[PDB]
C-alpha cells in the first residue's frame, strides 16, 4: 500500500541520474492500478537501454540460440563467429532432454566457427561450407543444422542464406540460417522473433503435402515450454492423463520431427506467449489451428488451465480432467498444509525476463505470500496489460531496471524474499535478503504442475527460513 510513498521513492531514486537518463528512466517505473488495463498510458517498455547503467538485458543471439533453437536436441546449432559467444552460452540453460549426447543429441555441446582475423577480413562463407561438410562427416546421426549468426557476421556482410541453400540442396539436409546478430534489437525479444521467423520459413512447412500421419481429435501441441528442470515433462504427463495426445513440444526436449508435425494438431497450448506468439498466430492463419494460453504454476492455476483446456473438447475429456483434479487434490492439499504456516505473510519482489514475473504470482498466493514488486527485462506492453490485472493494488512495476535502481528499491521496500537471475543473486544475498533464482530454479525443479508445486514450496521454505540469514551481524558489532 501507500502509493504516495512509492512515488516518492521512485523520484528519490531518479534524482541521481543525469537529465536525459532521468527523463528516459522515469517512464519505465510505475505504481500498479489493477483497474487500468492499458499499460501504454502507465509504463513504456521495449525500448533501448541507457548506456553505462548496468542493465540485465541480453542480446538477440541469446534469445535465438540460447532460448529457442538450443533446446532442439537432434539438430546441430553452430554459433557462426568468434568463440566467446558459444563458450559463455554452453550448457548454461537447464533445458532438460533425453538422448545420447554426441551421437543423436547435441544440446550441451558447443559447435562454433571460431572466426579469426582472416575470416573477418576475407569473410567466412567458404569456412562455413567446410564446417558443414565436417559436421556431416563427424556427426552422421544429426537430423538438422542451424547457423546462428553473431555480430561480425552481420557487420562484415556474409551471405549465409546462399551457403545454407546450396549445402541443403547438396546434402539433402535441412539447414536453417538464423540472422540473430547481437546488435539487432534491444534485447532477446527480437531474437525470439527472428528464431520464430526461421522456424516458419525453413522447418514448419516441410510436411505440408505429407498426409501419412494418423490424426486424432485429441491432438495438441505444447508451444513455448523449454523444459527447464523438466518443467515441460511435469506438464505433459497431466495432459496425457486427460486423454489428450501431445504430438509436439516446443522446444524443450524437442525434435525437428515434432516441429514438422505441429501443423497437424487440433490445438496449440502456448506457455510462453512472449516468445512463441508469432508462430502461434501464423499457424492459426495458414493452418486454422486455434491456440490458447495456459498456466501450471500452483494448484489453482493448474486446475483452472486444466478445466479451460478440457472445455475445448468433448465430455469424455472433461470427465478425465475432473478425475485428474480429484486424484491430485490430496497431494497439493498436503503440501499446502505443511508449508503455508511457515510462509504466510511474507513479501516477494520479482524481476525475470518476459513471462514468469506474472505467471508465478498464483503459486506465491497459493502459499499465502504477497508480491509487492514485479518487473520485466524485455516484455512488451501487452505483457504489462496482462500483468496489471494479476498484481496487487499500488504495487511496484519496473521495466528494464538497472542495478542501482533495483538495489535502492529493495533497500527501501525490504521484502522477505527476492526472485531474479544469477547477476543479482549474490548482490542480494550479501544484503541479507533470501534469494531464489527464478530462471534456472536455483538448479532445482521442476515447478510446473502438481509435482512441481511440492518442489517449489519446499524450496521456498528452505531458502526463506534458512538459519544463515540470522548470522549476518557479528555479536560484537
Amino acid at each position: 500500500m501507500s502509493r504516495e510513498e512509492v512515488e516518492s521513492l521512485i523520484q528519490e531514486v531518479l534524482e541521481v541520474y543525469p537529465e536525459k537518463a532521468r527523463k528516459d528512466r522515469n517512464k519505465h517505473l510505475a505504481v500498479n492500478d489493477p483497474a487500468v488495463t492499458q499499460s501504454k498510458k502507465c509504463i513504456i517498455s521495449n525500448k533501448k537501454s541507457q548506456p553505462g547503467l548496468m542493465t540485465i538485458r541480453g542480446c538477440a543471439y541469446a534469445g535465438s540460440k540460447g532460448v529457442v533453437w538450443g533446446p532442439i536436441k537432434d539438430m546441430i546449432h553452430i554459433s557462426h563467429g568468434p568463440v566467446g559467444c558459444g563458450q559463455y552460452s554452453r550448457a548454461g540453460r537447464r533445458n532438460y532432454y533425453i538422448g545420447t549426447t554426441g551421437v543423436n543429441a547435441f544440446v550441451t555441446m558447443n559447435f562454433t566457427s571460431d572466426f579469426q582475423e582472416k575470416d573477418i577480413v576475407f569473410g567466412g562463407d567458404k569456412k562455413l561450407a567446410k564446417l558443414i561438410d565436417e559436421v556431416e562427416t563427424l556427426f552422421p546421426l544429426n537430423k538438422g543444422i542451424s547457423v546462428q549468426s553473431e555480430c561480425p557476421i552481420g557487420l562484415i556482410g556474409d551471405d549465409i542464406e546462399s551457403v545454407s541453400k546450396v549445402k541443403g540442396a547438396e546434402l539433402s539436409k535441412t539447414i536453417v540460417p538464423v540472422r540473430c546478430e547481437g546488435f539487432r534489437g534491444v534485447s532477446q525479444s527480437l531474437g525470439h522473433h527472428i528464431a520464430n521467423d526461421a522456424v516458419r520459413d525453413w522447418v514448419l512447412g516441410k510436411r505440408d503435402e505429407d498426409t501419412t500421419f494418423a490424426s486424432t481429435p485429441y491432438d495438441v501441441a505444447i508451444i513455448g515450454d523449454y523444459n527447464i528442470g523438466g518443467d515441460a515433462w511435469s506438464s505433459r504427463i497431466l495432459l496425457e492423463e486427460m486423454g489428450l495426445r501431445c504430438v509436439a513440444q516446443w522446444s524443450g526436449d524437442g525434435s525437428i520431427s515434432e516441429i514438422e508435425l505441429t501443423p497437424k494438431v487440433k490445438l496449440n497450448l502456448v506457455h510462453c506467449y512472449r516468445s512463441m506468439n508469432y508462430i502461434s498466430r501464423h499457424m492459426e492463419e495458414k493452418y486454422g489451428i486455434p491456440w490458447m494460453e495456459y498456466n501450471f504454476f500452483g494448484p489453482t492455476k493448474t486446475i483452472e488451465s486444466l478445466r479451460a483446456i478440457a472445455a475445448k473438447f468433448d465430455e469424455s475429456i472433461q470427465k478425465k480432467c475432473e478425475e485428474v483434479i480429484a486424484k491430485y487434490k490430496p497431494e497439493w492439499e498436503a503440501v499446502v498444509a505443511k508449508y503455508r504456516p511457515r510462509l504466510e505473510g511474507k513479501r516477494v519482489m520479482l524481476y525475470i525476463g518476459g513471462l514468469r514475473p506474472r505467471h508465478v504470482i498464483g503459486a506465491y498466493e497459493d502459499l499465502g505470500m504477497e508480491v509487492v514488486g514485479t518487473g520485466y527485462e524485455f516484455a512488451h506492453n501487452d505483457d504489462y496489460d496482462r500483468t496489471m490485472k494479476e498484481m496487487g493494488d499500488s504495487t511496484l512495476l519496473y521495466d528494464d531496471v538497472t542495478g542501482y535502481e533495483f538495489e535502492e528499491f529493495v533497500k527501501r521496500i525490504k521484502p522477505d524474499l527476492i526472485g531474479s537471475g544469477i547477476k543479482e543473486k549474490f548482490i542480494f544475498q550479501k544484503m541479507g535478503i533470501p534469494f531464489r533464482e527464478m530462471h534456472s530454479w536455483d538448479y532445482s525443479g521442476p515447478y510446473h504442475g502438481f509435482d512441481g508445486f511440492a518442489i517449489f514450496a519446499r524450496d521456498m521454505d528452505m531458502t526463506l527460513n534458512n538459519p544463515c540469514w540470522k548470522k549476518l551481524q557479528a555479536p560484537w558489532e
Binding site: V16, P51, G52, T55, T108, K130, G182, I427, R458
Partner: protein
C-alpha cells in the same frame, strides 16, 4: 505423484514408472528417433582411431573449445584496480555473458557496464554511446576510474576509443582529469589472456607514458608483480605472504582478491581493495618488474622493458618445487633480502609430502588442459612427482610455447610418452583419451562430459576428472584454493593422491569380488 514427507527433485522423480512410460511413448510416437542399435554402433565408431583420424583432420569446425574472448580478460584485469569500473564499448550481450560467467565461477557479484550499441551505431559509430555511457556510469556508480575495452562489434566497425574519449572530455561528459584508460580487445585475436594483457598494457601506458622524466629505477625499493589472468584468490594471497615473510617491499598490480571475496555482513560493497592509482604512477620507480605468467604477458613485457627500463627476469610461473625455488632466489637477488627459515621449512615439508606420496603418485598417466602458463607449470610439477603426462592440450597456445613445453618434457624420463597439442579443442581430447586411455584428466568443469562418455564405453574405460583450472561451475568454493608456491604444490599433491586413493577404494569395494584389496591403511 509426490510424497509430502519425501519430495523428489527432477532426479529421481523422472525415473518413476509413469514418467518413464510417458517418455517412451513420446519417443516411440513423435520423435522419429534412430534405433538403439544404430546409436550404439555410431557411439562405438566414435571411440576408435579411425574416427580420431577423421577428427584431427578438421580445419574449419571447432567443437567444445577451451578458451574465451578477450573482453572477459580485460574485465578481469579492470576489476583489479581500486574503485575501477569495467566498461565495454559495444553490445550489452557480451557484458551479460561475462557477468554470468564470472558470477558462476566465483559465486560473487561482478560489476561491468556497456554502452549498448545497436544497429544505428553499426551505421554511424558509437561516439554518442560512449559519451552517454561515460557520463551515466560516472554519475550513477561513482567510480574513481573507468577502464574501457571493446567487443567484436566495435572492433569490426572501427571505433576509435582515443578520439571518442577525447571528445567526451572536451564536450564535458566526463571531467578532463578523470582517468579513462582504454584498450582494444578484438575477440577474433588470441583469447581472454590476451585481453588481460591488452587491458593491463593500456592502463600502464595511460598512467606512466607521459610522466617518465622524473622516474628513477629503484627509487622506492619495491618490486612490481603482475599476476596475469588469475582466477584463484589463494594465488594472490600466497604471493604476498611469501614476499612479506621475506621482508621484500612489493607492489602487486591488478589485485582483485578483495573485490571477489567481499564478506556478507548485511551490506553490498561494489568496490573493495585493488591497486591504487598512486601505485600505478609510482611503478616505474621500482627495482624491477616480475611477471608471474610470462606466456600471455608479452605486450606488457615489451612496454615495461621499453618504457620503464626494467630488466624483466626470465622466470617461469612459480609452480611446483623447482620453479618456486627459482622465483624465490630471483626475488632475493633483486631485493637483496635473504630467504628466511620459514620458507625453507615449508619447502622441506613439501618435500616430505612428496616422499610420502611418491609410491602412489609414481607412474600415473594424466591428460590435462587449460591456459599455457598453468598447463606448463602443472606439467613440470607432474614430472617432478614421477607422474607421466600423456595428453597435453592448450587451445590458446602457440608454436614457441609448444617448443618450450617440448624442451621441458625432453629433459625428464617421464615425458617420453607425452604429446603437446595447440589449437585443439575438447572433442580432440575426448578422441585422445578414448584411443590412448590415461589414468586421469585435469581440467575445468567442461571435462565432466568427457568422463560421462568414457563411462558409457564401460567402467574399465572411465577416465575420472580432477577440477583444476578455470572455470569450475559444478563445485563450490574451489576458487579459494592455492596453486602457486609451496602451498599450492601441497594442495595439488594432496588432490592428486587423494583422487587416486578414492578411485582405488571405489574399484575395490565389491564384497567377495574385489574387496580383498580394500585395505584400511594406504
Amino acid at each position: 505423484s509426490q510424497q509430502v514427507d519425501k519430495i523428489k527433485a527432477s532426479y529421481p522423480l523422472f525415473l518413476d514408472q509413469d514418467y518413464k512410460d510417458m517418455l517412451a511413448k513420446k519417443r516411440d510416437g513423435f520423435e522419429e528417433k534412430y534405433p538403439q542399435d544404430k546409436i550404439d554402433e555410431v557411439f562405438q565408431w566414435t571411440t576408435t582411431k579411425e574416427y580420431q583420424e577423421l577428427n584431427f583432420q578438421r580445419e574449419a569446425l571447432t567443437v567444445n573449445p577451451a578458451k574465451a574472448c578477450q573482453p572477459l580478460g580485460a574485465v578481469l584485469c579492470a576489476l583489479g584496480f581500486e574503485k575501477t569500473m569495467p566498461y565495454v564499448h559495444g553490445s550489452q550481450g557480451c557484458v551479460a555473458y561475462f557477468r554470468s560467467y564470472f558470477n558462476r565461477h566465483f559465486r560473487e557479484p561482478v560489476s561491468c557496464v556497456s554502452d549498448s550499441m545497436t544497429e544505428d551505431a553499426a551505421v554511424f559509430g558509437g561516439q554518442q554511446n560512449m559519451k552517454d555511457g561515460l557520463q551515466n556510469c560516472k554519475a550513477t556508480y561513482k567510480p574513481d576510474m573507468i577502464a574501457v575495452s571493446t567487443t567484436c562489434m566495435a572492433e569490426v566497425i572501427g571505433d576509435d576509443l582515443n578520439a571518442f574519449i577525447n571528445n567526451s572530455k572536451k564536450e564535458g561528459f566526463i571531467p578532463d582529469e578523470f582517468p579513462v584508460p582504454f584498450a582494444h580487445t578484438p575477440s577474433f585475436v588470441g583469447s581472454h589472456v590476451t585481453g588481460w594483457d591488452n587491458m593491463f598494457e593500456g592502463i600502464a601506458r595511460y598512467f606512466t607514458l607521459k610522466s617518465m622524466d622524473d622516474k628513477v629505477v629503484g627509487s622506492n625499493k619495491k618490486i612490481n608483480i603482475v599476476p596475469g589472468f588469475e582466477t584463484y584468490l589463494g594465488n594472490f594471497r600466497v604471493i604476498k605472504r611469501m614476499l612479506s615473510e621475506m621482508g621484500v617491499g612489493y607492489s602487486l598490480l591488478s589485485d582483485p582478491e578483495e573485490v571477489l571475496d567481499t564478506p556478507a555482513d548485511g551490506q553490498f560493497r561494489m568496490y573493495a581493495g585493488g591497486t591504487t592509482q598512486e601505485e600505478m604512477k609510482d611503478a616505474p620507480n621500482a627495482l624491477n618488474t616480475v611477471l608471474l605468467q610470462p606466456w600471455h604477458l608479452e605486450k606488457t613485457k615489451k612496454f615495461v622493458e621499453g618504457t620503464w627500463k626494467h630488466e624483466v627476469p626470465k622466470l617461469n610461473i612459480p609452480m611446483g618445487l623447482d620453479w618456486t625455488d627459482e622465483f624465490l632466489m630471483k626475488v632475493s637477488e633483486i631485493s637483496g633480502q635473504p630467504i628466511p627459515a620459514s620458507l625453507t621449512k615449508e619447502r622441506g615439508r613439501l618435500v616430505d609430502m612428496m616422499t610420502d606420496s611418491h609410491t602412489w603418485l609414481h607412474g600415473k598417466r594424466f591428460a590435462l588442459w587449460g591456459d599455457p602458463d598453468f598447463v606448463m607449470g602443472l606439467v613440470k610439477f607432474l614430472l617432478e612427482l614421477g607422474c607421466e603426462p600423456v595428453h597435453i592440450l592448450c587451445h590458446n597456445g602457440n608454436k614457441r610455447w609448444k617448443k618450450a613445453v617440448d624442451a621441458i618434457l625432453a629433459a625428464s624420463p617421464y615425458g617420453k610418452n607425452a604429446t603437446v597439442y595447440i589449437g585443439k579443442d575438447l572433442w580432440h581430447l575426448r578422441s585422445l583419451v578414448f584411443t590412448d586411455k590415461p589414468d586421469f584428466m585435469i581440467g575445468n568443469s567442461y571435462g565432466k562430459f568427457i568422463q560421462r562418455d568414457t563411462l558409457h564405453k564401460g567402467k574399465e574405460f572411465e577416465v575420472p576428472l580432477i577440477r583444476i583450472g578455470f572455470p569450475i561451475f559444478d563445485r563450490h568454493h574451489l576458487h579459494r584454493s592455492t596453486t602457486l608456491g609451496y602451498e599450492g604444490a601441497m594442495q595439488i599433491l594432496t588432490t592428486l593422491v587423494n583422487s587416486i586413493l578414492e578411485r582405488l577404494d571405489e574399484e575395490t569395494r565389491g564384497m567377495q569380488a574385489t574387496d580383498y584389496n580394500h585395505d584400511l591403511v594406504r
